[PDB]
Amino acid sequence: LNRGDKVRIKRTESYWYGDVGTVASVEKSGILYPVIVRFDRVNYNGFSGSASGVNTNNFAENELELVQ
């Protein structure tokens, strides 16, 4: 989409399936998953005992619904 412009993830395999994420950037370079979506909730990531996970993941345009 565009920077800002919060979307809801429709990718079923993701941690954030049904969560609202903000689009960080779109890499229009022929990428399979060009949309960087930034979240306010970190996922299950990292070795055991880690205090936080990652909040960024790449998505395709078909996996996102505009909600903003």
Partner: protein, 141 residues
């Protein structure tokens, strides 16, 4: 009817044991006051008060008055913790407000929780109490 129970004023096992009630507190007549208060209940074969919770208003003080008193306070604790958590998530750093309590915001929410049932009914009607199930993070089935 509770024919297997007897009132404690006419229960003979209670009467032989209410004269030896131990003083729980510093008042030397604590067990005698407990002997008078527990005499109105329904006692079993060995003189202990068997509470009735079926919904009878004769035994409303057994469960219903504890029910109304609990659900008011537990609804108060739940509402002011919910209303604090909604208020702090709109800030710049919502994470630090849970480990470091915004105490004047907490006192302001907690004193306003005496009208939680009229507030929970209002937020249910406004739709802000319950989120839509398609707007929630969901497991991949």
């Amino acid at each position: 009817d509770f024919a297997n129970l007897t009132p404690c004023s006419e229960n003979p096992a209670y009467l032989a044991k209410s004269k030896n009630f131990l003083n729980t507190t510093n008042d030397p007549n604590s067990g005698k006051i407990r002997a008078e208060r527990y005499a109105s209940a329904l006692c079993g074969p060995e003189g202990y008060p068997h509470l009735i919770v079926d919904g009878r208003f004769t035994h409303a003080g057994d469960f219903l008055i504890p029910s109304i008193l609990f659900l008011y306070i537990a609804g108060w604790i739940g509402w002011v913790g919910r209303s604090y958590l909604i208020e702090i998530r709109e800030s710049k750093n919502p994470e630090m407000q849970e480990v470091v309590i915004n105490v004047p915001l907490a006192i302001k929410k907690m004193l306003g929780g005496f009208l939680w049932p009229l507030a929970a009914v209002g937020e249910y009607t406004s739709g802000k109490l319950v989120m839509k199930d398609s707007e929630i993070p969901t497991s991949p089935r």
